[PDB]
Design a binder for this molecule. Structure first.
Ligand SMILES: [Cl-]
Lengths: 221, 213
């Protein structure tokens, strides 16, 4: 699989430091794992930094000049972004991209992105509440049940059902950002109403940023 | 953003659309333009590089041109799959920056309208034990992707403690949203019922829940 594996993102206090890594996978070294691009939630793509070779040279956006340093271990084809004196407005998804030149410049391969959050608020693990199947809202031969994943920071959170066994009928809704600065989301599964007595329903919630893991059994009443 | 694109464009399936990208001599004037497709909550994907060249796997119906300090992305045979944010990119020799357009949101129109499915959940015993109460109103399978939400305590409107998400495209190309009402356990207990009313293209779908104690 031709890909760029990112790491080193996460939550940092204002004024803090992160080192992003971008490891090339499935292709040979050609000095092209060479660009960092970021995207604030809701906003456009903002180019941050690039590196040239074989003679090393760093290029930087005005907004990061002096605070960020691009480098690459050529022998391990790993691109780095050292980020010092991180500001609130540096909060964004950071993509590394393979930068190439034919006639002109283009970025033909992007990492999946890593969320950098710059905030004085510390991480908070979710409270997980069962959304019980209702004794009337049982839509004839089906019932809705789910889990409320309440009051966590920052994103992301993962929800599975019955340890990955249950995928059909599952709808995990995008999170709401509450005024409190904490996220909530709901995961609902539509299931046969005959199975409610017999079949067990467990929502498995994982909040990596707070190292929080909750299994919540969802039963009627 | 240093390059200027229209915020949004739209057309019905099978038709064609153009997305302009406006710049200056130091960027588009003297350098090659790339176009990036971004689907919601995923990494950008290269469609077009060197003004007009398609990346491997990208079909002919996607085309790019450049004229002076402007670039154009053309999309024919419009599919619902083509709904995405489109960004032009180039080099700016004045600032020595890679630069981007602000992005253009492409909408595919004339898809069949559908009213929202609403499921309303009352507060869990467990949450009430924690001296909290959240009503969860879950709204799915509506098109176009816009709804208004109104919460009632018995018959009377309630504005306070409402948190609603923006609509988001599901995997079946219809939209989903959630609304949460925060209450005290005392507020939840003191009323006969609470309602989530969802209005979509002039029709209201309502769900009601009551304290079962
Ligand atoms: Cl490379």
């Amino acid at each position: 699989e031709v890909q760029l594996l990112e790491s080193g993102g996460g939550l940092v206090q204002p004024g803090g430091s992160l080192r992003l890594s971008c490891a090339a996978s499935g292709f040979t070294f050609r000095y092209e794992v060479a660009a960092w691009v970021r995207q604030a939630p809701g906003k456009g793509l903002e180019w941050v930094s690039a590196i040239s070779g074989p003679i090393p040279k760093g290029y930087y956006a005005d907004s990061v000049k002096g605070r960020f340093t691009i480098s690459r271990d050529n022998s391990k084809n790993t691109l780095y972004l050292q980020m010092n004196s991180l500001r609130a407005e540096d909060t964004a998804v950071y993509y590394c991209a393979r930068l190439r030149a034919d006639l002109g410049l283009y970025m033909d391969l992007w990492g999946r992105g890593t969320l950098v959050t710059v905030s004085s608020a510390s991480t908070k693990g979710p409270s997980v509440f069962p959304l019980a199947p209702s004794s009337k809202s049982t839509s004839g031969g089906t019932a809705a049940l789910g889990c409320l994943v309440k009051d966590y920071f920052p994103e992301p959170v993962t929800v599975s059902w019955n340890s990955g066994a249950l995928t059909s009928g599952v709808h995990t809704f995008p999170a709401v950002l509450q005024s409190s600065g904490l996220y909530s989301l709901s995961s609902v599964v539509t299931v046969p109403s005959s199975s409610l007595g017999t079949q067990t329903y467990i929502c498995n919630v994982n909040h990596k940023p707070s190292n929080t893991k909750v299994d919540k059994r969802v039963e009627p009443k | 953003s240093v390059l200027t694109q229209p915020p949004s464009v739209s057309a019905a399936p099978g038709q064609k659309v153009t997305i302009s990208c406006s710049g200056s001599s130091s960027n588009i004037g003297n350098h090659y333009v790339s176009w990036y497709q971004q689907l919601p909550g995923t990494a950008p994907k290269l469609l077009i590089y060197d003004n007009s060249e398609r990346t491997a796997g990208v079909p002919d119906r996607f085309s790019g041109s450049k004229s002076g300090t402007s670039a154009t992305l053309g999309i024919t045979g419009l599919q619902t799959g083509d709904e995405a944010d489109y960004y032009c990119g180039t080099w700016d020799e004045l600032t020595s920056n890679l630069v981007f357009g602000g992005g253009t949101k492409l909408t595919v129109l004339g898809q069949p309208k559908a009213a929202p499915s609403v499921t309303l959940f009352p507060p869990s015993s467990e949450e009430l034990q924690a001296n909290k109460a959240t009503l969860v109103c879950l709204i799915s399978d509506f098109y176009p992707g816009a709804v208004t939400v109104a919460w009632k305590a018995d018959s009377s409107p309630v504005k306070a403690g409402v948190e609603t998400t923006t609509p988001s495209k599901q995997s079946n190309n219809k939209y989903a949203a959630s609304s949460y009402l925060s209450l005290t356990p005392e507020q939840w207990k003191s009323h006969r019922s609470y309602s989530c009313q969802v209005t979509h293209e002039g029709s209201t779908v309502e769900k009601t829940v009551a304290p079962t104690e």
